[PDB]
Amino acid sequence: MLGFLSARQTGLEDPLRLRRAESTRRVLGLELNKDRDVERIHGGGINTLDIEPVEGRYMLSGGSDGVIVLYDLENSSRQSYYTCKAVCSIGRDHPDVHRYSVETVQWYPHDTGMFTSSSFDKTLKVWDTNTLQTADVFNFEETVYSHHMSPVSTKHCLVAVGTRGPKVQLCDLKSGSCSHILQGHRQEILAVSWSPRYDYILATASADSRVKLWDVRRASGCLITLDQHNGAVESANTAHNGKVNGLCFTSDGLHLLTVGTDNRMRLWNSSNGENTLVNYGKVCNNSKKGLKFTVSCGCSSEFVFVPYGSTIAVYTVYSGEQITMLKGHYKTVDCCVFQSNFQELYSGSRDCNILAWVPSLYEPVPDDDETTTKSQLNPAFEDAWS
Amino acid sequence: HHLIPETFGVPGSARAAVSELMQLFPRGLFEDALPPIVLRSQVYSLVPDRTVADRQLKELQEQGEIRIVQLGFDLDAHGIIFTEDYRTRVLKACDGRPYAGAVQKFLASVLPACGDLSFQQDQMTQTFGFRDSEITHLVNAGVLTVRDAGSWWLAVPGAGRFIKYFVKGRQAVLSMVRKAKYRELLLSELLGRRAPVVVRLGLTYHVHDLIGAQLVDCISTTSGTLLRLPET
Amino acid sequence: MADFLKGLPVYNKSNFSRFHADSVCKASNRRPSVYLPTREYPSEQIIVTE
Amino acid sequence: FKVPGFLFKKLFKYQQTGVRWLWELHCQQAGGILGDEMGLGKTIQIIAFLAGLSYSKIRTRGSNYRFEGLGPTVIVCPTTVMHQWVKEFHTWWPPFRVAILHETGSYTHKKEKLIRDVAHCHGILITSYSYIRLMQDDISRYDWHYVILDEGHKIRNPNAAVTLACKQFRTPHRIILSGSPMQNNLRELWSLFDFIFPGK
Amino acid sequence: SRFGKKRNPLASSSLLAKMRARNHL
Amino acid sequence: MSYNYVVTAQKPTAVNGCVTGHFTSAEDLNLLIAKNTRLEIYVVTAEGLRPVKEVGMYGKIAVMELFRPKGESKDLLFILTAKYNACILEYKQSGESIDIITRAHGNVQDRIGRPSETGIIGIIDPECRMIGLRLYDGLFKVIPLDRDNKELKAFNIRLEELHVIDVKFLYGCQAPTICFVYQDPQGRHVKTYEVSLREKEFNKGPWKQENVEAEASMVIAVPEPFGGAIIIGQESITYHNGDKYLAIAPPIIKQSTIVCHNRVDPNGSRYLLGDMEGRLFMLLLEKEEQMDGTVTLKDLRVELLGETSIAECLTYLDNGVVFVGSRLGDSQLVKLNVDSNEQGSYVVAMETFTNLGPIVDMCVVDLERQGQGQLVTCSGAFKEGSLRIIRNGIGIHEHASIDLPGIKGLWPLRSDPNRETDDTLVLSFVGQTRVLMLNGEEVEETELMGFVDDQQTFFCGNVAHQQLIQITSASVRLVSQEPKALVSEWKEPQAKNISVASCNSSQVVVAVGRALYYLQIHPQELRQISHTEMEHEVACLDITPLGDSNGLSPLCAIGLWTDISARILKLPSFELLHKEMLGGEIIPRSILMTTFESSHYLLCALGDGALFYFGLNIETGLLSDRKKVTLGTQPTVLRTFRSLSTTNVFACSDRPTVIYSSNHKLVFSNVNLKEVNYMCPLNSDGYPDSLALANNSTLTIGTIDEIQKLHIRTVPLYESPRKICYQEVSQCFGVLSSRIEVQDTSGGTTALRPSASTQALSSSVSSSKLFSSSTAPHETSFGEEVEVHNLLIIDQHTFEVLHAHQFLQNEYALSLVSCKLGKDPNTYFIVGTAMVYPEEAEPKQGRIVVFQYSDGKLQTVAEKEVKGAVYSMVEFNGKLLASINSTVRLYEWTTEKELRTECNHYNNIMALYLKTKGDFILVGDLMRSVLLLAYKPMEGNFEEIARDFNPNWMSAVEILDDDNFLGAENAFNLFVCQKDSAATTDEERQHLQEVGLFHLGEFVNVFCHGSLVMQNLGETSTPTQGSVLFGTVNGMIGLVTSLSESWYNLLLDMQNRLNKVIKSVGKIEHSFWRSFHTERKTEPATGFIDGDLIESFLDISRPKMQEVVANLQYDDGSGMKREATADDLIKVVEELTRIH
Ligand SMILES: [Mg+2]
């Protein structure tokens, strides 16, 4: 540390280096609930989490109960230990509440005043955050597994919806259009994800074992089908020997991660679909529904956090190296989300907990001359062989 | 020495690994009719960085040193075979048989030029000029097996004998760990134990597979390497 | 003597030939006078990103 | 994209806007319906755009259509307007090779060979709707770059066989010219948009 | 307003206004 | 909002890059130097670097490359800014008007991307086909460069090599080919690609990919005869060109990393290399010309030429000269001699360019108790480390000084009528007069005829009709200049002594108590014109002429003893035209009529050292705009002089002070000298344009320095200074410093060089039981580098190192404070330390050590072991406040002289910075921005009042006042946080609001309260409250100060107008440059006025000032808003310039 501080003060190293090094060290030090609980509002499993992109203060949660909960993550108490309290909820008393489990919540990418929700009740809903009233509602023939709004598109406001139907659907919130379908897939579409680099490029994953990249401006059909063997454009390509149930672009958009029920994670070049041949080993993935997982941002290494049964596995994206297993939950983890500002990970599970994983690099320090106001050696940490 | 090491708290080649594993293969058990097969899993037991292993294997494929074949008994079941063993054994098996000429054509044309695990009918018909009857000759020879209509895996003749012995041996050797006390067994003790009659391919070959497939965890101990069933 | 620093590039024999060590002679006229334009001309080209 | 100055000067501002709209569709790889009321000169807007494509040598990005210009075009129209299209091409952009696939066409060999020639040299094929309906294979076998349906309200019944034959063309650059996008029903509009932008 | 006070594009308030006007009378 | 003014007091000094080419003409040799945001242009000449222009940029200059497209007559300049602004600047010239033409401009930021760890790289193709930029991982950005296109069209190409180290274009390639070093888990590799502009793809490059040394860090592309690339590592240098390979592993390199290179020749035979220690090498490629006539590289040969300042960049110039651009030390101009000197060096230094370097810490001290502070700074690092003492004030360069006690008067004289320059100096003494002849530099006492020595003189000089005059107490004597013979004498009719006299070229007035006499000077005649007796005895006189008057004044100024008045008299009649009662009790000792610019003034000084100044109407004699300044405390003697084109004024006192007008308003610049009781100008052949200045012990003759000009004194330490504080009761500075030592074979450590800590008059080594009894020993390999930390005690007058106390092995000293504690009357140095071990990411141990400096030694008074690094400490209401890792802790000082913990606060990640005001503590965290605590005396505890919840990575903090908190941030931004007055909930009350945002473009290390301008101008007229100085990595010193809402709104609109009217370079928008910017967010600037923009408006043509002020409404303080004139805003901006 003191070396980094000296090098920064003297301009020997760019201020980038201390910042990225310490961010990486913090990710390596994640510990369960060290400073922080999250308030138990849900009665069911936590299907989905989304941290607000503007300030990172607020987290939406959706669950198998159909409830949507909005949490405040900032410690506005003066204590070193605190609870992330629920600001407000769309509970079962609300008229517009979802009838069946809520499978994706996403903030509007450009300000916090609106958010979107989807559910196995075959709806996509648009919510006014200040009032928690729906502004628009879209209905579908089939249960929605996933939806996404483009994180970078200013030009268009399209929601991609993946359903049990074989056709991807696109809803235009500006016009209210929901007629536009993409017709290339053959089974249920389990994950959809817009490129963070390009306004118009949508990745889609399906139980047909295919990941397809689309340019939604075109009348032409899809661009690229990912072939895990690298050899041919559509006739037989598969990304996994199983269902493909999760997508995550890397934070630069240059690669796409995919996870599937073959228990493998695979890294792809997003500009042409080449399998980069990074091998992570067995990544346990039994999930028959979409799996949400996340990369880090702003670290010296790009990490990926992936549900691994009841654990969260951490890998280095490019090296394939398994770094740690975060070992908290009692049932399968369904989502995790990364707070980029402070390198804190939140995780939802079918055990109904939301758990915070927080960098725990060192303890509060005593003064040895104190009587009892020290940083206490609690007797729970003591042996008792007598 | 004084800054970069602070950034975070965190050599055998695939060619060497393949060449070592290839000697564990019991050639006489098959009257040498099979070319020696090493599984991709076993390579990861000697080259623990799976990414480096896979990339070096891909480069050996591009030099044409090795063939990768899908063995179908599991999703990841890839056999690694030296091209010259494969070519010699298949030509020796084809001598005077009715499918022989199509197999000579396949080994003279497709395999020198393609690394693929599978071929589609478009390539087979138009790029290599196979007649539909010649694909039938190749399937009779065992060099292809039907993947789907108009598509075929590259195959090894007689792979069923090996695959039978491997699948039963794998379950046997895994049960030797499962049944031993604590589900623990020291590797030196296992390799010293009289192998089951079910374990026909040999006991070291299987421990390298099991370790590479992550079916057993190695734990290091003062007593040496210890096998465990993984917490899974 | 270094044989290898012989014949360093000479561009004009009199450059630095009156580098006075009496730096007080430079101490006043040391600094360039600040440039602050108010005339302008249009540029011949523009850089755009595809 | 560039239109030759002598051609762009000859166009009205609404025709210039139409050429720009056609270029924005070509960049999106979407079709469009040029629905202007009868008399506004739709054909000039089309020919001026196609001339612009041929003139500016648009190198197609990232894809097998590595033309440097305009590839084979088919125009489908009533037989009563085929020779008007030929005259307009021979006036406004003489370099094109415009050929009628019809008994009023000048070709002497079998009409199968004309389609091969016009595909090979990237000419403009002009056809009737009846030949599209009858020569489905010999037409749709080739990689046409543009399909223009003049009086494209002829494909307004989705169950009609001319409609099904027109939808076999693989190119994304599908254009309809019609004064009436719809006449009776919103279903007619569906059929035209299902040609222009399938799945929209 | 607790939310929408800061931008990270169409502002939420105008997209919401269009959706409401489209769904009300 | 809250309203702040930020201005540069000193321009950044660290050199970020340099290039040499023919930018300004096809024939000139130019050197271009990038200082941060501050491009500048020199030619090379017979006199060395001649300046040409200096330019600013709305950007941190990241890349700067000269190139010449085919069909350009001279080089164009490419600049890339850290905000990714691009421009292809062109120089041009129309006589004396020099205009940098922006030729092309744009921006090349990606919407999303990961900035690379080795920073922005920018390269230009040898044939000027394209620029290549490496901004982000996985991407290489190509800017095509062309001619018939009006537009250059940046595109983008995917790299698979994500961790690219260094890149160059190769010479001699028919397609533009990059060579680069990249890193992968398998190590570092070298690789090549061709670039296709037509396909916008990489094609397979000419060479096989090859492995290289694990620390290979530079690619040098060798020009066409050789081609290829040289890869430089820590241990080897390797040449690559296709199938050809050479490697050398010179042992002389291995001690230090090579960081910069320059080509010293057209064809690559001689590259220079510079290392992190400051050694210069000459990499020396040996060609073999093959029998077919092709040329091949035979060998590589590394050589040692000497030590320079630690080099960021190198450039070779001409005939043997190298510019050494430094960030850590002074930049240098050095030659290479061909014959090794006796020490083994070829390098010889020629010029040194002042770099305030990394300002790691600083303090403001009124060392002379004058009421004008000086900055003392910890500047530089390693062997470049120094203290710098910065003072605002006018200097003088001394050409002669002479032991001449008791001087009572000074005048120049010219004995030869044919010279224009002076040749003689005349001195006055008690009852005596003496004369010094000026035989160039040689000064000799000589006798001049006609003058007299056995009388005291009150004036002498050259006068009309080729004559010399002397006025004594006895008589006025007029001497013919060529004969040197007396031609007239005037004496009072009763032989009463002259008590006051004044003279010009044509007239004399003399006083005899109350009697005045007016004389005209004529050929061979002193002609008495008229006489008068004043009401009161005459104290001082002037008849200096003004305006277009032909060497005769119409006015006399007079000062009187008894009424203490200044008066203006019409010369021929002694008619009283004005009478001004100065008041007080002390007589006017000096009076002086003078012209400043176009404006005429009267100056008068009292015997107590106050001065009054008045605007003088030369036609009516009226005085106007009476104002007073306290210049000094001794009887202050005014003099005119002429310097350059302008008449200026000097006040002889214990505080030498210059008076002149800037934009019609007078300026008072104090001078860097102890005392001058008499001064006059001189212009001899040896002492041209000079001033004589003298005191009661010495006479000094010299040229006065330029105006308001900051002066920097350097005290070299040869070791890195970490912290400074001043102890007034000991008259010394405590300085923390660190030196690097190598582990010796003996297991001790050996110093690389002598340094301030090794050369004190006295020294001590710490000993303690604390860690030695509680830790196992720890060790390093032989030759491994160790930091040794010291407390240095430095004398405030001499800056000699009086004492060096060396801390324990592996002990790092982080924080220093000088204070009294508790009820203890003693003043202590308190040092906070940490124990640093190779195995531990953060220190687990440290101590607070209390020292007393007394009797020349340093005594340890107390030690407190603490379980962490003591990052910061401050004195807090007699207690000691310390931050120990995440913990903020307050210590009482007990009567037993021990530290006792009072209370703790724990809710931090890392409490790097502390400041205090009253009971408030402002805590700057490593990454949780700022936190405001309050100590609560009734409870003995802290309360966490509020914090800023934004994720700002802090570099420094300051408390501006009880409500406004200034913070500086990792991405070169300032922000101001404020406690929210609109808060209703206790949640809202805990949120600090960011009210000010400003992109400074500098990394701020230190804030402190103070000013370099004299405080004694204590008017209430100040438009500007408080003064916080800040110091920077690039050696820029800035000033933050607070405005009123009305002045903020005025200057904000004045900025918006100037931004329409002032031109820039690269046509960067000013609002874009000042926009708050991080990788997370960009926001426009709020709550800050850019003083460097505001002050520029003084610098324009007045047509542009009229375009700026057009339709502006301004309030002068009456509320009578009017259309602002240009002169109103000239006075506003003048008033702002006087704060720094
Ligand atoms: Mg028509």
SS (H, E, C) F14-67: CEEEEEEECCCCCCCCEEEEEECCEEEEEEEECCEEEEEEECCCCCCEEEEEEE
The CATH code of domain F397-712 reads 2.130.10.10
- Residues whose CB falls within 8 Å of the CB of residue F24, separated by 6 or more in sequence, listed in order: F30, F41, F43, F52, F74, F91, F93
* D41 in a known ligand binding site: yes
Number of CB pairs, chain A paired with chain E, less than 8 A apart: 66
Distance from CA of D145 to the nearest CA of A (A): 13
Gap between the Cα atoms of F658 and F631, Å rounded: 10
F397-712 and F4-360 share a CATH fold:
yes
Q: Which amino acid is at F139?
A: L
Which of F182, F273, F173, F176 minimizes the C-alpha distance to F223?
F173
User: Position of tokens 């074992």?
Assistant: A209
Gap between the Cα atoms of F137 and A349, Å rounded: 35
**CA A179 to ligand 1 centroid distance, Å:** 30
Q: Are A5 and A281 in contact (CB under 8 A)?
A: no
Q: Which amino acid is at F268?
A: G
A191 belongs to a structural domain: yes
A109 belongs to a structural domain: yes
**CA–CA distances in Å: residue F434 to residues F401, F405, F457, F473, F474:** 17, 12, 9, 15, 16
**Domain span at residue A1?**
1-361
Q: At what angle do helices D42-56 and D82-92 cross, to 10 degrees?
A: 50
Closest CA in chain B for residue A6? B3
**CA–CA distances in Å: residue D194 to residues A168, A171, D164, F1060:** 17, 18, 11, 53
Do F320 and C8 lie within an 8 Å CB cutoff?
Answer: yes
**CA–CA distances in Å: residue F374 to residues A252, F737, F798:** 49, 21, 15
* Resolution for the entry shown, Å: 1.9
Number of CB pairs, chain C paired with chain F, less than 8 A apart: 147
Q: Are A90 and A68 in contact (CB under 8 A)?
A: yes
Q: Which amino acid is at D187?
A: R
Are chains E and D in touch, 3+ Cβ pairs below 8 Å? no
Query: Cβ contacts (< 8 Å) between A13 and chain B: which residues?
Result: 3
What approach was used to elucidate this structure?
cryo-EM
Gap between the Cα atoms of A312 and A325, Å rounded: 6
Gap between the Cα atoms of F934 and F920, Å rounded: 4
Do A277 and B8 lie within an 8 Å CB cutoff?
Answer: no
Give me the long-range contacts of F94-102 (CB less than 8 A, separation at least 24): F97/C39, F98/C35, F98/F52, F98/F53, F99/C37, F99/C39, F99/C40, F99/C41, F100/C35, F100/C37, F100/F53, F100/F55, F100/F1065, F101/C41, F101/C43, F102/C43, F102/F1065, F102/F1066, F102/F1067
Nearest 5°: the CA angle A155, A161, A167 is 110
Residues forming beta bridges with residue F933, ordered by sequence position: F921, F944
- Residues whose CB falls within 8 Å of the CB of residue F475, separated by 6 or more in sequence, listed in order: F489, F490, F491, F498
> What is the token pair recorded at F328?
């850590």
A371 belongs to a structural domain: no
* D62 in a known ligand binding site: no
Are chains D and B in touch, 3+ Cβ pairs below 8 Å? no
Query: Cβ contacts (< 8 Å) between B2 and chain F: which residues?
Result: 785
Residue A160 near chain D (CB below 8 Å): no
- Residues whose CB falls within 8 Å of the CB of residue F315, separated by 6 or more in sequence, listed in order: F18, F19, F20, F31, F262, F322, F323, F325
Q: What is the DSSP letter of F991?
A: B
Greatest C-alpha distance within chain F: 110
Which of F520, F501, F502, F506 minimizes the C-alpha distance to F462?
F506
The kind and range of the H/E element at D120 are helix D111-120
A309 belongs to a structural domain: yes
Do F186 and B52 lie within an 8 Å CB cutoff?
Answer: yes
Do E6 and A174 lie within an 8 Å CB cutoff?
Answer: no
Q: At what angle do helices B159-179 and B203-212 cross, to 10 degrees?
A: 80
Q: Chains that contact A by 3+ CB pairs under 8 Å?
A: B, D, E, F
Mapped onto helix, strand or coil, the DSSP state of residue F609 is: coil
Tell whether the torsion through CA atoms of B54, B60, B64 and B68 is positive or negative: negative
Q: Are A200 and D9 in contact (CB under 8 A)?
A: no
Gap between the Cα atoms of F70 and F88, Å rounded: 15
Do F1101 and C23 lie within an 8 Å CB cutoff?
Answer: no
Do A111 and E20 lie within an 8 Å CB cutoff?
Answer: no
Q: Are D173 and D93 in contact (CB under 8 A)?
A: no
Distance from CA of A10 to the nearest CA of E (A): 34
Do D199 and A183 lie within an 8 Å CB cutoff?
Answer: yes
* D182 in a known ligand binding site: no
- Residues whose CB falls within 8 Å of the CB of residue A285, separated by 6 or more in sequence, listed in order: A242, A245, A246, A259, A260, A261, A262, A263, A291, A307
Distance from CA of F393 to the nearest CA of A (A): 29
Q: How far is CA F738 from the centre of its chain?
A: 25
**CA–CA distances in Å: residue F1048 to residues F403, F490, F1011, F1089:** 55, 65, 21, 7
Gap between the Cα atoms of A268 and A279, Å rounded: 12
**Helix residue ranges per DSSP H, chain B:** 14-21, 40-46, 50-63, 83-94, 100-113, 121-122, 132-141, 159-179, 187-192, 203-212
Pairing outcome for strands F177-184 and F163-169: antiparallel
Residue F186 near chain B (CB below 8 Å): yes
Query: Cβ contacts (< 8 Å) between D198 and chain A: which residues?
Result: 183, 219
Q: Are B29 and B200 in contact (CB under 8 A)?
A: yes
Distance from CA of A114 to the nearest CA of E (A): 6
* D105 in a known ligand binding site: no
Do A108 and E13 lie within an 8 Å CB cutoff?
Answer: no
User: Position of tokens 């048989």?
Assistant: B97
> What is the token pair recorded at B200?
């026909």
Which of F360, F370, F367, F359 minimizes the C-alpha distance to F796?
F367
A92 belongs to a structural domain: yes
Which of F127, F199, F213, F235 minimizes the C-alpha distance to F166?
F213
Do B50 and A25 lie within an 8 Å CB cutoff?
Answer: no
Count of C-beta atoms within a 10 Å radius of residue C44: 13
Gap between the Cα atoms of F163 and F138, Å rounded: 8
Do D28 and A217 lie within an 8 Å CB cutoff?
Answer: yes
> What is the token pair recorded at B199?
């374990």
Query: Cβ contacts (< 8 Å) between A17 and chain B: which residues?
Result: 3, 7
Q: Are D92 and D48 in contact (CB under 8 A)?
A: yes
Residue A14 near chain E (CB below 8 Å): no
Which of F402, F446, F453 minimizes the C-alpha distance to F428?
F453
- Residues whose CB falls within 8 Å of the CB of residue F320, separated by 6 or more in sequence, listed in order: C8, F335, F336, F337
Gap between the Cα atoms of F879 and F902, Å rounded: 9
Do B214 and A281 lie within an 8 Å CB cutoff?
Answer: yes
* D32 in a known ligand binding site: no
Q: Chains that contact D by 3+ CB pairs under 8 Å?
A: A
Q: Are D41 and D15 in contact (CB under 8 A)?
A: yes
**CA–CA distances in Å: residue F1121 to residues B38, F389, F1020, F1054, F1128:** 93, 45, 21, 16, 12
Q: Which amino acid is at A142?
A: E
Closest CA in chain E for residue A127? E16
Q: Which amino acid is at F881?
A: L
Q: Are A102 and A117 in contact (CB under 8 A)?
A: yes
Do A254 and F138 lie within an 8 Å CB cutoff?
Answer: yes
Do F29 and C19 lie within an 8 Å CB cutoff?
Answer: no
User: Position of tokens 């309360």?
Assistant: F943
Residue F901 near chain C (CB below 8 Å): no
Residue A101 sits at φ, ψ, to 5 deg, of: -50, 140
* D18 in a known ligand binding site: no
Pairing outcome for strands A82-84 and A68-72: unpaired
Distance from CA of B158 to the nearest CA of F (A): 39
Q: Are B85 and B35 in contact (CB under 8 A)?
A: yes
SS (H, E, C) F712-751: EEEEECCCEEEEEEEECCCCEEEEEEEEEEEECCCCCEEE
Q: Are F120 and F82 in contact (CB under 8 A)?
A: yes
Q: Radius of gyration of chain D from Cα atoms? A: 16
CATH number (2.60.40.10, 3.30.70.1560, 2.130.10.10, 3.20.20.10) of F4-360 reads 2.130.10.10
Distance from CA of B13 to the nearest CA of A (A): 16
Distance from CA of F1001 to the nearest CA of B (A): 25
Q: Cα torsion at F232, F238, F241, F243 (round to 10°)? A: -150
**CA D159 to ligand 1 centroid distance, Å:** 23
Do A231 and B116 lie within an 8 Å CB cutoff?
Answer: yes
Which of F871, F876, F883 minimizes the C-alpha distance to F819?
F876
Q: What is the DSSP letter of F310?
A: P
A213 belongs to a structural domain: yes
Q: What is the DSSP letter of B126?
A: I
* D9 in a known ligand binding site: no
The kind and range of the H/E element at F987 are helix F986-990
How many independent structural domains does chain A possess? 1
Q: What is the DSSP letter of B181?
A: G
- Residues whose CB falls within 8 Å of the CB of residue D159, separated by 6 or more in sequence, listed in order: none
Do E8 and A126 lie within an 8 Å CB cutoff?
Answer: no
Do F841 and B1 lie within an 8 Å CB cutoff?
Answer: no
Q: Which of A110, A126, A136 sits opposite E9 (nearest CB)?
A: A110
Residue F1097 sits at φ, ψ, to 5 deg, of: -65, -35
Q: Are F1037 and F9 in contact (CB under 8 A)?
A: yes
Gap between the Cα atoms of F636 and A36, Å rounded: 71
Residues forming beta bridges with residue F788, ordered by sequence position: F739
A377 belongs to a structural domain: no
Query: Cβ contacts (< 8 Å) between A219 and chain D: which residues?
Result: 29-31, 172, 174, 196-198, 200
Q: How far is CA F1078 from the centre of its chain?
A: 28
Give the burial class of D149: count Cβ atoms within 10 A of its Cβ; 0-12 exposed, 13-18 middle, 19 or more buried. Answer: buried
Distance from CA of B232 to the nearest CA of F (A): 30
Query: Cβ contacts (< 8 Å) between B9 and chain F: which residues?
Result: 841
Q: Chains that contact C by 3+ CB pairs under 8 Å?
A: F
Q: What is the DSSP letter of F585?
A: S
Q: Chains that contact B by 3+ CB pairs under 8 Å?
A: A, F
Distance from CA of C4 to the nearest CA of F (A): 8
Q: What is the DSSP letter of D79?
A: G
Gap between the Cα atoms of D33 and D38, Å rounded: 14
Which of A323, A312, A314, A303 minimizes the C-alpha distance to A49?
A312
Q: Which of B7, B58, B118 sits opposite A21 (nearest CB)?
A: B7
